[PDB]
Amino acid sequence: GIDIERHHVRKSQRSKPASENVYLKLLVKLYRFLARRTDSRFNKAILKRLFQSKTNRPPISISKIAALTSRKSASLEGKTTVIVGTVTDDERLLTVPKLSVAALRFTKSARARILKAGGEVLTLDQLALRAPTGSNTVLLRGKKHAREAYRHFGFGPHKHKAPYVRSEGRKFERARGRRKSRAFKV
Amino acid sequence: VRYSASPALETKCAKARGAYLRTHFKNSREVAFTINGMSLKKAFIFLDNVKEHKQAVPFRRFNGGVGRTAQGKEFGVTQARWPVKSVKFFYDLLKNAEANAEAKGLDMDKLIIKHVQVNAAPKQRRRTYRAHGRVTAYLSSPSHIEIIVAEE
Amino acid sequence: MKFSRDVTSSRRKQRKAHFGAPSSVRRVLMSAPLSKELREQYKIRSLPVRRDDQITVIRGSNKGREGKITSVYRKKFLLLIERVTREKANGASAPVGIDASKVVITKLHLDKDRKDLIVRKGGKV
RNA sequence: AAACUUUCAGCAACGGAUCUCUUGGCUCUCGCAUCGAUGAAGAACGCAGCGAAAUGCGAUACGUAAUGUGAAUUG
RNA sequence: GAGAAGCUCAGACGAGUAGGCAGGCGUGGAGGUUUGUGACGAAGCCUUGGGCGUGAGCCUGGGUCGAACAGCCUCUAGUGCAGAUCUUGGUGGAAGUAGCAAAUAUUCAAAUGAGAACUUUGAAGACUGAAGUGGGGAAAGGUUCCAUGUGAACAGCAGUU
RNA sequence: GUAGAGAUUCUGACGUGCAAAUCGAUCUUCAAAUUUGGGUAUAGGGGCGAAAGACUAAUCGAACCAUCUAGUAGCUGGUUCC
RNA sequence: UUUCAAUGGCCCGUCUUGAAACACGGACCAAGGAGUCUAGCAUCUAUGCGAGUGUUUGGGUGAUGAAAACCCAUCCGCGAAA
RNA sequence: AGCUAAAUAUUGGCGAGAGACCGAUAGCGAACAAGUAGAGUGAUCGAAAGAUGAAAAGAACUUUGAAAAGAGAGUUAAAUAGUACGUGAAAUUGCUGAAAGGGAAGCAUUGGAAAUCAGUCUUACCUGGGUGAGAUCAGUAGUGCGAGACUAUGCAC
């Protein structure tokens, strides 16, 4: 006998994508090699995010990219933005600046507006050629907790989360237990 | 039809069989076991003696409750009977095998019963009436019999 | 390939319609090819067989035999041909049936209706 | 030593699984609108050379007339 | 090169009900594919032969048999049994056992017949004993009536009846 | 006291029966509130009852048939390969 | 493979704190035999598109052969505001 | 007070075409003389049961038997298809063979005994040795400029 207590025994991470997309497999093949034959944390970051599910790879819009790369103390002037995910458009940004973006996917509107403003769109394999270790790159992520489910997670007394309701209005969970005039509030 | 065995020269043997014979399977097995291996002439003598209650058929397997007799002594048993209905079917089948051998010109002096087998035929069904308005089976147990005699 | 909505390719229906066909329908079902000489003479590929027609057997153990059609047993889709028999146990000769598709007609029992059937079928006399 | 009992195999029984089949079922879709006092639906009894159940038929009775086909029916 | 879904080096570890997850095995049917198997024997089945897998299972020799069937990638489901006093069918040990003992009772000869305790004839011995084991009817049955034949099944033994 | 109608006791026989109530002996009644054929009426919360919750086709403290109905079960049983 | 010898081995399933139980089911064999389909909801994953998204209520090539494929307008649902 | 087509419905009836459906304990209760046989006074209840073979060629005739049948024969591709008929499992049974057995049997481990099964080896490839005959091989000549592979005409005999 041996007295071993085993808590973090099996690693909890993905070692490969769940996707069967053959081209994603080709990108993983490229970045398995790059993350192994370089000392770059950027390449290990790309390889890890290439495995992640859709909900763990939220989109980012060109407005957020334009805002994140144009801060007052930025120096992120002429550097390529990289996201392992989809780049969407923000139609509210009437005038798009000149941007260099590397992404898994571009929305048709996002791609057209980036190019029309004189910028450039790259796939991740084109990025690997240009910056094989991700030097002078802005690695970005979308907002993970913006999806609907995070309005509800952790619902409970005084947690101020959203209930699961079929309809919204009075008569739909706004009565006893939700106000002082009806027994108690939450 | 196929006999269950061929323990003899095809040219020096004869065959007889009966199917769906309405005589008791258990009694017939005991008769067959006793006459198997006998000479044909002595089998006829023994079968006639069983008819006369001069000799008996030892009941060796299906012997539950069979009575005792001093005629079982010659076979070293105590339980023996005289199932004459089964005896008659065997006597007729043995006569048929003898006639079959006489047709093939075998020497009717060395003929030995080389093979005899009883198989349980499909049962025939009757009913009997039991107390409290019940009905239970009253079946018959007919037999298939095959015999092969051969020169010794 | 069939295209008509009025044609069924159902195996169940086709088999029911074949084995349940009435007597007059079975007559057309029991057709035989005409011989090469007869095809040219009458411009007809095949006909429903008939009693007193002359055929030769083209398939089976009786291939190459010839004779009149003594009877058309439509209930069994069988032709009985003269002198095509087999021996029973007791020496009597039992006729052997042959399918109409397995013979070729070498001489037709031409008569008024048969002559009308040749002209109607586009043939010549 | 047999008999006896037990297991296995061959062969023979008993029984009808398995496999293959299928003029049947089930389901879907398309199309159609037509019972009866001018006696319906249903019931009974009869009708064939040899026919009891089914099909058919009604003392004109496995049918008459009429039309089509064109040599069978068949145990 | 080493199905990169690959290859290679190393260390630690191994109970499990209820329960959870993964990877596999097997079955019917669907799409694709395999100059796929097959009357020179498909499928199925038997086996006192062989091989593979930790296992689910799989392959094969011999026998039997006679008309279809399989591998690989996918699709799909009425998809896997020891149990449910489970269902339907078949078949056992109990067993040649329990038993076939109410209602007095049979016997001799002949005929017939392959065969007679049980048929028929004669003889004897008996019984019901007129509130009958006699002679009719009503209800109910429906051909059971009669003659000639038969004797598989039935007549819980027998059968020429 | 016989026929008929009953059914006390043996707590007899039988108790996988001759029989889902019978058999033997014994016993009750035997000219009337008697026994009984046929016809006829009463039908299920209904009938009918000299009353035992009896009887109403081997069914009765609410018959039998079909349907609602695969009624519901915090309960019992089962729940198929590695 | 069979059998022998030596050593070990209680009858499975089940409910149970606890079954070899003097707890229940199970004589035998075959075939059948039990988490399904549907209207929703929730998490997680994949795919498409993305401030949008959803051709199948409908209409068209359509007659040929057409329950498929393929194409096409206005609404509308959900989302873009509480 | 009143009438009215179409677009809508349709587990009945009639006709038609289909199916990733079931395949004889399944599928309708009924693939078959099925709402039949059978049960109940009645209302009602309600089954079981498909397959010889291409063709009956459905076994002449002889013989034993009172007969049913058996044995010879015969037909058939097959009777290891005989109508008690395709295949023909298991339970259960008879015969034969093998083996074991002092109040259960079965199983596991290990070997003995007996029975039974597989090695097909030393094949391939390489070299040496013996004789044998033969269109004869390395460098080259010529026919896409420099280097490399190939075939092809000859020489190298």
Ligand SMILES: [Mg+2]
């Ligand atoms: Mg026994």
Ligand SMILES: [Mg+2]
């Ligand atoms: Mg006794």
Ligand SMILES: [Mg+2]
């Ligand atoms: Mg009785």
Ligand SMILES: [Mg+2]
């Ligand atoms: Mg473990």
Ligand SMILES: [Mg+2]
């Ligand atoms: Mg299925």
Ligand SMILES: [Mg+2]
């Ligand atoms: Mg085979």
Ligand SMILES: [Mg+2]
């Ligand atoms: Mg075995």
Ligand SMILES: [Mg+2]
């Ligand atoms: Mg292994």
Ligand SMILES: [Mg+2]
């Ligand atoms: Mg199931």
Ligand SMILES: [Mg+2]
């Ligand atoms: Mg079972």
Ligand SMILES: [Mg+2]
């Ligand atoms: Mg179980």
Ligand SMILES: [Mg+2]
């Ligand atoms: Mg049971």
Ligand SMILES: [Mg+2]
């Ligand atoms: Mg006894």
Ligand SMILES: [Mg+2]
């Ligand atoms: Mg007296």
Ligand SMILES: [Mg+2]
């Ligand atoms: Mg007297």
Ligand SMILES: [Mg+2]
């Ligand atoms: Mg009288």
